[PDB]
From Swiss-Prot, chain B:
Catalytic component of the RAG complex, a multiprotein complex that mediates the DNA cleavage phase during V(D)J recombination. V(D)J recombination assembles a diverse repertoire of immunoglobulin and T-cell receptor genes in developing B and T lymphocytes through rearrangement of different V (variable), in some cases D (diversity), and J (joining) gene segments. In the RAG complex, RAG1 mediates the DNA-binding to the conserved recombination signal sequences (RSS) and catalyzes the DNA cleavage activities by introducing a double-strand break between the RSS and the adjacent coding segment. The RING-type zinc finger mediates the E3 ubiquitin-protein ligase activity. The NBD (nonamer binding) DNA-binding domain mediates the specific binding to the nonamer RSS motif by forming a tightly interwoven homodimer that binds and synapses 2 nonamer elements, with each NBD making contact with both DNA molecules. Each RSS is composed of well-conserved heptamer (consensus 5'-CACAGTG-3') and nonamer (consensus 5'-ACAAAAACC-3') sequences separated by a spacer of either 12 bp or 23 bp. It comes from Danio rerio. In the adult, predominantly expressed in the thymus with lower levels in the pronephros, mesonephros and ovary. Homodimer. Component of the RAG complex composed of core components rag1 and rag2. This is V(D)J recombination-activating protein 1.
Length: 351, 232, 77
């Protein structure tokens, strides 16, 4: 467990507070960018490199057949594992554009080719959703399950804007939790089903969801309706037997008061939970370890590295996981005149 | 409020009743919203200015009914977004800025194609085609490479969020031609068409004799930046 | 039209009133009551057909622009 300051050499004004790290095929890819794609990168995506503390950003390049993507803010990132047919996939859906709007489309991102000179090329295939599509929402979660043995994807949670009847120029910027119904989407074709469950009284937002062996455990769950941060941990167990996807659930006693967490995979299934926040005011500082197996998730607190006075005294803080028990975090920065690089960086490490 | 004209009862057109005598004045410019925000972050600007766009778009259809002159009466509206600068005009329309290859907001000629042919052109740009061409850029139905997807849409990258009349701004045009003639005068004092590659030293040096010449003749001290009256 | 502070105006009001008045200017609280005719949110109207996703109250004055932002810290602030 350790934290180290990193200095972003240059081009750090394009990182915004909500953004994503997709770790696939060696290098990790920054996604989500401040503003629209400057012709410095008409794509929008970056390869990130950490070297002697330096945070260096390179501009990725799409393939010819790929459709291009506008930068979602807080979408649901889903790692689709490497197998037939085209390994390996990232399911990105849905976020909010750099223009404050919600994008209810489904994008699939993969790796294509390298180098020549180490360069790595990506490609995005937009995937049609027939349905029963879920409405554009943000803060939700998407997860991949393998059930005897077909792979499917489960979509649940997240806020959205007021319905377009009550959408009011006085309630525009207000969000209300979209209703809590689980969407089962096939990777191919685009057939999306909607299920409802009784135990799910209300939808959530910002609750990290985990999936293994076609079962999903949901932590946190800041509900803005009752303003609670429920520490109950939820479980659902689904099985796809053609043609209905029968789905069941259970509530568990204990989960955790965390919203917006940074979950880094380290082992096969051992995770370190970095956490965003315990309370409205008071951010989360302790680090926890979350293993999970066929029994269930097994919880353990880890010694958090000693935070600098700066990072202990931050009003807000966010970040993400470079993966494999190492994570990257950013802090709003105050200065006069404004630096302007607003955000400071730590490299956190497990063991 | 630019003009008010009349339509009832038919056959004819709009009969103007009122046309603003001094539209360029400040005293006739009505503020609606103030923010402590920068123009740059698109995120915060659209978050705030969204409800406004929906109202404009939602007001275009209906008819107003107001007690005026003693009677309830009905109005219709035509909005003309023209008071934007080009930085924001191009920002607000998905276009790339500002030394881009596609220079013109109205026509499709590149920089090269704008030094070759100066005059023969036709107005093309508007809102809706920009929307559809953004579609062409996002869906990518023809599986084209970046530079050529760039070429099929002719500079349409980001999604327009707002409609602005495709119009030119007067005042900044005067400033641009004035900075160009100022830069040209700096070059001509010295020999630029004799020596095609000067350094910065002669540029500041040429600027110094111009400024001295401007003060002795016409009585105008230099400005860090040429405001409109100095351009007059 | 002169950037006159409320208190600057009252000093002048006392000044011109006490001396030879026959006050001419009006007090502040009648300026403050005779203005609501000039600012927005006072006259009635009706849009035919009904405006899209706009409330029907015709008396809204100055509203704050966040427009019902869901202030919770964890989201965009
Ligand atoms: Zn043109």
């Amino acid at each position: 467990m350790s934290l180290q300051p990193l200095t972003a050499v240059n081009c750090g004004s394009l990182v915004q507070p909500g953004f994503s790290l997709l770790d696939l095929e060696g290098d990790v890819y920054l996604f989500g960018q401040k503003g629209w794609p400057k012709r410095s990168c008409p794509t929008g995506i970056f390869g990130v490199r950490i070297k002697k503390g330096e945070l260096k950003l390179r501009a990725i390049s799409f393939s010819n057949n790929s459709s291009y993507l506008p930068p979602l803010r807080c979408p649901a990132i889903a790692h689709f594992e490497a197998q037939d047919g085209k390994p390996e996939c990232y399911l990105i859906h849905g976020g909010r554009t750099p223009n404050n709007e919600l994008s209810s489309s489904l994008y699939m991102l993969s790796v294509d080719s390298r180098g020549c000179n180490r360069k790595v090329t990506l490609r995005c295939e937009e995937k049609e959703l027939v349905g029963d599509v879920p409405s554009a929402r943000y803060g939700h979660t998407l997860s991949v399950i393998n059930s005897r043995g077909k792979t499917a994807c489960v979509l649940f949670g997240g806020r959205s804007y007021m319905p377009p009847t009550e959408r009011t120029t006085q309630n525009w910027n207000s969000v209300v939790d979209c209703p809590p119904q689980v969407y089962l989407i096939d990777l191919e074709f685009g057939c999306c089903t909607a299920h409802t469950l009784p135990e799910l009284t209300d939808g959530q937002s910002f609750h990290v969801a985990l999936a293994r062996q076609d079962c999903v455990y949901f932590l946190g769950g800041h509900i803005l309706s009752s303003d609670c941060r429920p520490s109950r941990l939820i479980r659902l167990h689904v099985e796809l037997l053609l043609g209905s996807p029968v789905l069941t659930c259970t509530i568990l006693h204990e989960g955790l008061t965390i919203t917006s967490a940074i979950a880094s995979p380290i082992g096969y299934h051992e995770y370190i939970i970095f956490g965003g926040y315990q309370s409205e005011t008071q951010k989360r500082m302790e680090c926890t370890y979350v293993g999970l197996d066929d029994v269930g998730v097994h919880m353990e607190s880890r010694e958090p590295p000693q935070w600098t006075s700066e990072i202990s005294h931050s009003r807000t803080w966010f970040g993400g996981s470079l993966g494999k028990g190492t994570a990257l975090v950013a802090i709003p920065s105050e200065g006069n005149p404004t630096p302007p690089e607003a955000y400071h960086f730590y490299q956190v490490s497990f063991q | 409020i630019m003009s008010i004209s009349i339509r009832l009862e038919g056959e004819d057109d709009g009969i103007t009743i009122f046309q603003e005598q001094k539209p360029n004045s400040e005293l006739s410019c009505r503020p609606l919203c103030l923010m402590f925000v920068d123009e740059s972050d698109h995120e915060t600007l659209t978050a705030i200015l969204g409800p406004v766009v929906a109202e404009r778009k939602a007001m275009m259809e209906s008819r107003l009914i107001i007690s005026v002159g003693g009677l309830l009466r009905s109005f219709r509206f035509f909005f003309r977004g023209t008071g934007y600068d080009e930085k924001m005009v191009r920002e607000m329309e998905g276009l790339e800025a500002s030394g881009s290859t596609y220079i013109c907001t109205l026509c499709d000629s590149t920089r090269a194609e704008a030094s070759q042919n100066m005059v023969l052109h036709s107005i093309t740009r508007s809102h809706d085609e920009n929307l559809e061409r953004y579609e062409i850029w996002r869906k990518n139905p023809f599986s084209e490479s970046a530079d050529e997807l760039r070429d099929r849409v002719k500079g349409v990258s980001a999604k327009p969020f707002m409609e602005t009349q495709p119009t030119l701004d007067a005042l900044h045009c005067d400033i641009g031609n004035a900075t160009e003639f100022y830069k040209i005068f700096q070059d001509e004092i010295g020999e630029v068409y004799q020596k095609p590659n000067p350094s910065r030293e002669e540029r500041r040096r040429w600027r110094s004799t111009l400024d001295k010449q401007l003060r002795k003749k016409m009585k105008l001290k230099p400005v860090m930046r040429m405001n409109g009256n100095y351009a007059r | 039209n002169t950037f006159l502070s409320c208190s600057q105006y009252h000093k002048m009001y006392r000044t011109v009133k006490a001396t030879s008045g026959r006050q001419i200017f009006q007090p502040l609280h009648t300026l403050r009551n005779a203005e609501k005719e000039l600012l927005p949110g006072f006259h009635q109207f009706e849009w035919q057909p009904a405006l899209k996703n706009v409330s029907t109250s015709w008396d809204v004055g100055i509203i704050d622009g966040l427009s019902g932002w869901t202030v919770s810290v964890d989201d965009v602030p």
